[PDB]
Amino acid sequence: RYGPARLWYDMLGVPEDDLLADENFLMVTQLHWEDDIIWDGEPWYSIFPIDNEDLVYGRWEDNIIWDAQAMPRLLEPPVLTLDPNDENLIL
């Protein structure tokens, strides 16, 4: 309740505490890659960066609210997790 989004919590007043075929979606068939063609232009620690595991793996699509009244599951308040994989954060 007191974390980020406390303003929303206080305003609410809660106080406890065939077109679906895989090819259609391949980005060769969905991207104007012609624009890229350049015409007359003018490891002990990781070598590559580490991607957001939640974006790469998690089903964030399950947080889309398709119908406000008929919501298939019950959502819960989210706690701040302060991922330390991201640089630019002191801790």
């Binding site: 068939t29 969905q30 991607d51 398709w66």
Partner: protein, 85 residues
């Protein structure tokens, strides 16, 4: 957000197009959410509306079923339907 951040490890754009597509092709969806699906799919680009929107252009007939000839005119489906149109 899927032009700046979609990478082949991310699969942001393909997973956004798949949600929009199975929300649009599936019937029982309201005209507001179909409007949102068509709006996102049509803001993605030209090849997306070539290979997603243009097969279901016959759905416009199913739309004009409820526009040119509706038993209930004073409902809220007509403004959303001709906005979709």
């Amino acid at each position: 957000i899927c032009k700046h951040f979609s990478t082949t490890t991310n699969n942001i754009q393909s997973r956004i197009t798949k949600t929009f597509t199975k929300s649009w092709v599936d019937e029982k969806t309201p005209w507001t959410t179909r409007y949102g699906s068509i709006a996102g799919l049509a803001e993605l680009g030209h090849d997306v509306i070539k290979t997603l929107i243009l097969p279901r252009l016959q759905q416009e007939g199913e739309r004009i079923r409820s526009v040119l000839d509706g038993p209930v005119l004073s409902n809220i489906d007509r403004i959303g339907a001709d906005h979709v149109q």
